[model samples]
Target: SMALNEADTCRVYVTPKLKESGWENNPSAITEQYTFTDGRVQFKGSKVQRGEQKRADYLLKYTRDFPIAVVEAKPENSPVGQGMQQAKDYAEILGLKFAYSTNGHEILEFDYTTGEEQLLSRFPTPDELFKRLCGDEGIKDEDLDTLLSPYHHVPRYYQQIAINRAVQSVLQGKKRSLITMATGTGKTVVAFQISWKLWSARWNRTGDYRKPRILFLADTFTPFGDARHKIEGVVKSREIYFAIYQSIPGLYKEFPQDFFDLIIIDECHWREILEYFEPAFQIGMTATPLREDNRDTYRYFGNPIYTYSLRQGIDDGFLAPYRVHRVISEVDATKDFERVIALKARTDAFAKHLTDFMKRTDRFAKTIVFCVDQEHADEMRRALNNLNSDLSRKHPDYVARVTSEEGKIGKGHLSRFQELETSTPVILTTSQLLTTGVDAPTCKNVVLARVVNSMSEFKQIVGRGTRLREDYGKLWFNIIDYTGSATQNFADPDFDGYPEIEDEVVIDEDGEEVV
Candidate 1:
């Protein structure tokens, strides 16, 4: 049959081929069989197991920690191009521009920067690859050490790329850098690493030897709880600070304009803070991309240096894949009755439909229902509470309203809802508050009782269900749509957003379609 198996091909032919190109001289610059992820958690009935882990055959580095390229090796009998597709996939995931495919002798190189592919006699040296990378990224010779400064812990492949590019943009004297990464992809972690590198290297706007003073602006309650601890606990530096925007305006006046060297803004739809600190290098992070509604964020930060999207997250198995349940309803027919009447009948019908679906699956499943507004959320909560009276009677918190109006009591309910161990307060009713920031890992359902207008908002709402908790049987989630928002958003060209479909027709007020 074949002259050599895959392992033998890598050992005898591939290793020698790489050694011929000077990879042998640098032992620290090469990694063999690098396993990046512990396989994705998967469920079968009540039991859970992990899917096969993904690894790269060969990861070539420009230096110890700076990976420049990936090489995928097939068996001796296989053609060189046979591994090109897989090599390209790995390279894309690793955020590298160079990808090589080889089966011992022949090598095919795919250059992402130039969008070209060709057969190469031998692999390029680490120096050559680093030179090419610097050229492509506009990296200065003086900036390499700072850019390659080690992270506190290794970041995921895409996260590393985002950090590198953002740092590069700042080093190149670009005042602003935006990174649009999906929810649960650790945007805050990326921000911290960027700050860490700049701080550790003593690279500041003034070019002084002193460490850069950095500021991170986030949610009032701090979704960036990780950043505070990592920076305080690990880095333990006085120069770095975290704050909510509300506290800044009053506090910022005490300091001079050029006090901070770097400022990172999380969920950066708010652009007023950037106006205050003109001298500082600012980085903006968002879970959604710039759209018509949030064009101001794009205008403020410029185009994103890197964007890790929901579709990419789902494909990489980092985020949960979703199924769409298009619960068609005639509730829109009562549009004229907005604020005039309670619309109690329509709310009850939708509640019954939601309960029917949940009963068929699991009645006590944690869910979030996006209603129109505070008043509508209260109405929806009442209906759902009455419909699930069996549970609500026993546990009054089974369905609760989580909105700004409820204040501290609502905040308490939200905290309990986010806990995996707690079962009560199984459903949260909100208008717009729960669309983003909240991380309810075991939430199995995202019920859309209100309309989602923009691609940005729709994706953020969907992200509410994208966190996977396999041990609790939350492998995937459902988008049970009543207002056709999910359907419309899925059809939008801008949204690369399509999910497995489960069409459920909720008959009109009289138990039949409109026709």
Candidate 2:
């Protein structure tokens, strides 16, 4: 062993070993003197304080985005594992698996993920280590390592929990997995990270080193489209595919059923979706998994492997939490299309009241006006414009009816409305078109011109306002429910994704039941 300082130890042993193992000739892969936020705070000399930020000596990443290892170096004069504890601490803080400490002589290594520790002759090659914790499970080193995009956005705590749980579940042979997160919690981004890690780790059912053919399926392209740009630069377009269910070419006979290694289904509650693909390791994403609305979802996906609920999203600051404003009307006045609902009447009275609310508060905020049907939508559209004299004069297209009846022209307007740069269609009126799978990140307000009974549909509706729009300076949102259900309390996600058996009801003789 050479008597050297921490910096020298790295130059002599760590760097050379890492090069031999992999991550060589790749300028962007290995990060040195990496700095992290340290997450510490205190009162400084009575002057108030934030946190003391710290830096890690080495952060070994597979792609520029996904860090796999954290290394802490000590001088050769000290014990081989002098900083092993610190190494482990930083590794956990950084969402990495391996934590290592060395002093140019021997290496002390700890698997932060599995709590396994060891003394090593030299650093294990990247492939040898990844294969070790990964076990005989699916996915390989190169595939997982190479299939990443340079786009670097760290997953928050809830997101990390989801990723860890999903990978382990899949590795342990869980076939179909469900992941439920609130809207605007960036589920698409989370989905991309999951896919990116799986592909980079080369995790598959067979445990071989082959690039996976990923199929991302959705009923609508809005959510799927945002992810296309971040499909990972390491993987080419031809290798990964997205198929919109409604318009999948050739009834999806376009390719063999088993052509894909991983199948990702968005809004999987539309249970008919699974019919299109042969079985494979699948990750299903959705905001709501209501029992009655999606009867088959629980049985099919077998409980979510991980869940990032609405409350978690708001608490963690990824989504905009909300407040409710309720305007009561006669219970009998409330109605729904084909008419079987209970809320405010769809008469001129409700629209005029909504317009007054808008004018008094935020008449220009990106808003969604949901109605009962296309006819109801048209009526509310004209009512809103006729009531808001000042708004219509300044922004003519401020109130556009984008019901399915408008077709392509409506879609064009909807697309422009989604763009943060343009302010046209500031208040979009719709019955059913904007409810599922669309992300209006900039939408600051939601007017419940209607009431929803289905918990799944209700959650999806409130989701329209929960998306975080930091660019538009939105810290939170407001939901104005015209009906009695406007308490702004949508049932939160099932944090514990597992299902429990209820004690059997034993109606013994009379109407008495056993819990």
Task: Output the number of the lDDT-best candidate.
Answer: 1
**Which ten contiguous residues of candidate 1 have the minimum total lDDT?**
227-236
Which digits, one per residue and each the tens of the lDDT, describe model 2 over residues 1-515? 54776788789877877776676545335677986542322234644233445678888866455466878888778886678999988876665678898776778999855677889877766656556546633544433433332332435545655666566666566778888776666676666766766765556666678756677876622323433522221234454576665655244554566656678876776344356565667888777654677657777777876666666455445556565665554422323443423322443666766666666777778888788778778877887788775778988888888888899888887888888788778878888888873567788777776656577777777778777656676556667666545344343435311111111112212222223
Superposition error at 408 for model 1 (Å): 2.0
Candidate 2 lDDT at 266 equals 67
lDDT of all predictions: 0.78, 0.65
| Alpha-carbon deviation at 429 in model 1, angstroms | 1.1
Candidate 2 RMSD to the real structure: 10.8
Per-residue error for 400 in candidate 2, Å, reads 1.4
- Please estimate how well model 2 matches the true structure, expressed as its whole-model Cα lDDT: 0.65
